[PDB]
Coordinates of C-alpha atoms (C1' of nucleotides) in Angstrom, one line a residue:
Chain F
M1 CA 10.8 -8.9 -17.1
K2 CA 8.0 -7.1 -18.9
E3 CA 5.4 -4.5 -17.8
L4 CA 2.5 -6.8 -18.3
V5 CA 2.4 -10.4 -17.1
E6 CA -0.5 -12.8 -17.1
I7 CA -1.0 -16.1 -15.2
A8 CA -4.0 -18.5 -15.3
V9 CA -5.2 -19.4 -11.8
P10 CA -7.8 -22.2 -11.3
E11 CA -11.1 -20.8 -10.1
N12 CA -11.3 -22.8 -6.9
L13 CA -7.9 -21.4 -6.1
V14 CA -8.3 -17.7 -7.1
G15 CA -10.0 -16.6 -3.9
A16 CA -6.8 -17.3 -2.1
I17 CA -5.1 -14.4 -3.7
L18 CA -8.2 -12.2 -3.5
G19 CA -8.9 -12.8 0.2
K20 CA -11.8 -11.5 2.3
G21 CA -13.3 -8.5 0.5
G22 CA -10.2 -8.5 -1.8
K23 CA -8.0 -7.5 1.1
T24 CA -5.2 -9.8 0.0
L25 CA -5.1 -8.7 -3.6
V26 CA -5.0 -5.1 -2.4
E27 CA -2.1 -6.2 -0.1
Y28 CA 0.1 -7.6 -2.8
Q29 CA -0.5 -4.4 -4.8
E30 CA 0.6 -2.2 -1.9
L31 CA 3.6 -4.4 -1.3
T32 CA 4.7 -4.6 -5.0
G33 CA 3.4 -1.4 -6.4
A34 CA 1.9 -3.3 -9.3
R35 CA -1.7 -3.6 -10.4
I36 CA -3.3 -7.0 -10.3
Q37 CA -6.5 -7.4 -12.4
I38 CA -8.4 -10.6 -12.3
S39 CA -10.8 -11.6 -15.0
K40 CA -14.5 -11.2 -14.2
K41 CA -16.3 -14.0 -12.5
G42 CA -17.3 -16.7 -15.1
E43 CA -14.7 -15.4 -17.5
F44 CA -12.0 -18.1 -18.0
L45 CA -9.4 -19.0 -20.6
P46 CA -11.2 -20.8 -23.3
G47 CA -11.5 -24.5 -22.6
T48 CA -10.8 -24.2 -18.9
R49 CA -12.0 -22.9 -15.5
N50 CA -9.0 -20.7 -14.9
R51 CA -9.4 -17.0 -14.2
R52 CA -6.9 -14.8 -16.0
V53 CA -4.7 -12.7 -13.7
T54 CA -3.2 -9.6 -15.3
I55 CA -0.3 -7.9 -13.6
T56 CA 1.0 -4.5 -14.8
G57 CA 3.5 -1.9 -13.7
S58 CA 7.3 -1.4 -13.8
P59 CA 9.2 -4.6 -14.8
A60 CA 10.5 -5.0 -11.2
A61 CA 7.0 -4.6 -9.7
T62 CA 5.2 -6.9 -12.1
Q63 CA 7.8 -9.6 -11.5
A64 CA 7.6 -9.4 -7.7
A65 CA 3.8 -9.4 -8.0
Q66 CA 3.8 -12.4 -10.4
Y67 CA 6.2 -14.2 -8.1
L68 CA 4.3 -13.7 -4.8
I69 CA 1.0 -14.7 -6.4
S70 CA 2.3 -17.9 -8.0
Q71 CA 4.1 -18.6 -4.7
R72 CA 0.7 -18.0 -3.0
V73 CA -1.1 -20.4 -5.3
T74 CA 1.6 -23.0 -4.9
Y75 CA 1.4 -22.7 -1.1
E76 CA -2.3 -23.1 -1.2
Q77 CA -2.2 -26.2 -3.4
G78 CA 0.2 -27.9 -0.9
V79 CA -1.9 -27.2 2.1
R80 CA -4.9 -28.5 0.2
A81 CA -3.0 -31.6 -0.8
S82 CA -1.9 -32.3 2.8
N83 CA -4.8 -31.2 4.9
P84 CA -8.5 -32.1 5.1
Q85 CA -10.9 -29.7 3.4
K86 CA -13.3 -28.1 5.9
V87 CA -17.0 -28.4 5.0
Chain D
rG1 C1' -16.9 4.5 0.8
rA2 C1' -21.7 2.2 0.9
rG3 C1' -25.5 -0.3 -1.8
rG4 C1' -26.0 -3.3 -6.7
rA5 C1' -24.7 -6.0 -11.0
rC6 C1' -21.9 -10.0 -12.7
rC7 C1' -20.6 -15.7 -11.2
rU8 C1' -21.5 -19.1 -6.7
rA9 C1' -21.3 -27.7 -5.1
rG10 C1' -17.2 -26.4 -1.9
rA11 C1' -12.1 -22.8 -1.5
rU12 C1' -12.3 -15.6 0.1
rC13 C1' -14.1 -11.7 -5.6
rA14 C1' -11.0 -6.8 -5.3
rC15 C1' -10.6 -3.9 -9.8
rC16 C1' -14.1 -2.4 -14.0
rC17 C1' -19.4 -1.1 -14.6
rC18 C1' -24.4 1.0 -12.4
rU19 C1' -26.8 3.9 -8.2
rC20 C1' -25.9 7.6 -4.0

RNA sequence: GAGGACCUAGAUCACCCCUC
């Protein structure tokens, strides 16, 4: 556990942790007490289309935050790998 | 808070910044 954790979340997947108007992101912050900061649009890790997600706070809060987010991204991937994409 | 900027083939953009 550290006070600042970073994850790289594919761009087409980042909106899942942001949510409508950012209401999900805000939710995870209220629930964990940690601050989640996502890179600005168009800003990705070099040589990729992954947005940088920066989590900060107490070690316990940054770890819960990092876990719920990754869990959230992993949940999404599954649903997207099982179900048909609406268009 | 609300406009805006910044990116958008689809798969959510808060925070920061600007204006009030």
